[PDB]
Write a protein that binds this ligand. Sequence first.
Ligand SMILES: Cc1nc(=O)c2cc(CN(C)c3ccc(C(=O)N[C@@H](CCC(=O)O)C(=O)O)s3)ccc2[nH]1
Ligand SMILES: Cc1nc(=O)c2cc(CN(C)c3ccc(C(=O)N[C@@H](CCC(=O)O)C(=O)O)s3)ccc2[nH]1
Ligand SMILES: O=c1ccn([C@H]2C[C@H](O)[C@@H](COP(=O)(O)O)O2)c(=O)[nH]1
Ligand SMILES: O=c1ccn([C@H]2C[C@H](O)[C@@H](COP(=O)(O)O)O2)c(=O)[nH]1
Lengths: 278, 278
Amino acid sequence: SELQYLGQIQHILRCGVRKDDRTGTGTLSVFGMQARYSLRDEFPLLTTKRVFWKGVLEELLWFIKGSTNAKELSSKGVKIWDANGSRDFLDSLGFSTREEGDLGPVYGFQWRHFGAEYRDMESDYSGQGVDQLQRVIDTIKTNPDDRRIIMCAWNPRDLPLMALPPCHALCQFYVVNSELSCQLYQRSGDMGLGVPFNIASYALLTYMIAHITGLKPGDFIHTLGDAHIYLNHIEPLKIQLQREPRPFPKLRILRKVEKIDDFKAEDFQIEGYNPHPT
Amino acid sequence: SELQYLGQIQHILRCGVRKDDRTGTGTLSVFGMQARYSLRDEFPLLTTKRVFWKGVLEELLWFIKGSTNAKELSSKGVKIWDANGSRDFLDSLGFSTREEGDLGPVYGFQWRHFGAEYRDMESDYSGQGVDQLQRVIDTIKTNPDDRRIIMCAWNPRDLPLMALPPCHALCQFYVVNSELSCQLYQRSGDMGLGVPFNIASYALLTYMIAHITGLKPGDFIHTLGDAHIYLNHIEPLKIQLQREPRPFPKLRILRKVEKIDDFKAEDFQIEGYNPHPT
Ligand SMILES: Cc1nc(=O)c2cc(CN(C)c3ccc(C(=O)N[C@@H](CCC(=O)O)C(=O)O)s3)ccc2[nH]1
Ligand SMILES: Cc1nc(=O)c2cc(CN(C)c3ccc(C(=O)N[C@@H](CCC(=O)O)C(=O)O)s3)ccc2[nH]1
Ligand SMILES: O=c1ccn([C@H]2C[C@H](O)[C@@H](COP(=O)(O)O)O2)c(=O)[nH]1
Ligand SMILES: O=c1ccn([C@H]2C[C@H](O)[C@@H](COP(=O)(O)O)O2)c(=O)[nH]1
């Protein structure tokens, strides 16, 4: 099913009109896309180009902890969020009083404390806001047929405080025949970098929730708003586009976990990941 | 085109799985679906089965007003929400102290006063909460390339207060070459009734915003979470699939409106809508 991805990369490079991004760099853009990734006895960690798995793993565990401090992620060798929490950036946004690394009410905070009043990354928010993550887990356990199993990171109120608007605005879970599926609504997707990572990321979330709810991972539906390839990647991705997709690896969860919060980086083992070099 | 929709119908029939809902009515379900409807010189008002246009138009103008009073819509000849706002149904949700017609913080409220504290339908919320509607309208005019033009109805906090959890979690707008597109993330889709009406609803909103932002309607991307067919509709739908889809009608905005709040039902006229019998 990695072909669907490549396909999406193909479709954008042959019907994708040009559209400049927030910065100034242009991109080839298509609006509204979807790809289905089976999670059955296999993990969708793209093989046509290596995905920064550690980053994926550590970032999610970071979202789950409810952390909004980029330093707590950087400490794990995953610096993908450091620039957005650096003294300069925070200042350029008007957050002069913010301790360095304080990203604001972002992903982690929304998932676990949606609606709560943000103070700073050091603050305790226990028992504050809606714990969407635990709610989806509990809903799955109690009413799997439920069609409102949603976790939304998009918080219009908190938007102005974020050291970045979330790309993963919303995700929905679905259960049938003891299979747990998840669909992500990605408002903006950098096909060349973020997307493969995001796919892996939510595939992981699903594996985790599945494992905790005693379900089997179903599918990960990936939906894109602005699916785009930055102009400077148009050829490199065309290079990748000709690479032969290899069998997806397998994600082994080593220990049984009672709660999403208990998962630790060492409980996860990617097996048989044979991605193309460079 | 309508074939997309019809194709989705056959897919749910040919590959959907049996899944039970809240009422336990039983359904053929597929999780994760996406259709693309061109809004260029045509309005996606389904022809293989009449769609309650007046309802679509009135409910939408009703959302825009920020109204959460079903009596407000019901007096427009649209009772689609009356049951949910009835003394009886409100009491089954625990809103026994809530004035009849009061659906709680639903779409209208979510779109114009997001994050504000809901009191009741009679309350003045002006200046309170985030006005997503105007915001997306503003962003389209000032920075159409914005990859964050989102309008979210899914308020994790407000959800319980609503007579009914939103099916239109959020929608995103996109702009390229003077064309305004819109993608709707529908968590639960009744392919036999709601969906066609939902599709129209947002097509109408897109047509409405393109007009105020001086853009052309491009595409309306319909994304579904739990796409389903109720088992008792399987026979009907089977017949509909036989039907020859007639050209989609056309929407004409008679008056030249400047602000999203000035749109009146009179300003809209559907043209050449030949919905199939019964
Ligand atoms: C234009 C743009 N595109 C992106 O994809 C993007 C992603 C993030 C955050 N994110 C969600 C990321 C996921 C993966 C990443 C990355 O830089 N991977 C590198 C290097 C990591 C390493 O090995 O140290 C790689 O694997 O090539 S960054 C922030 C701004 C962005 N900006
Ligand atoms: C199981 C279920 N499926 C739905 O599609 C659904 C839809 C709504 C709201 N909605 C989005 C609606 C769209 C159209 C409607 C309707 O009742 N149309 C009538 C109109 C006739 C009349 O004027 O009385 C019809 O076409 O029969 S209702 C509420 C509960 C639901 N429940
Ligand atoms: O998890 C992530 C985070 C970011 N991005 C990319 C998409 C866009 O190229 C850019 C986001 O900035 P805007 O969408 O706000 O322009 O980052 C991803 O693909 N995945
Ligand atoms: O605009 C709407 C509102 C509701 N529904 C249908 C879909 C489901 O059949 C049912 C939703 O109920 P739950 O998802 O809450 O079970 O209503 C639609 O299709 N469109």
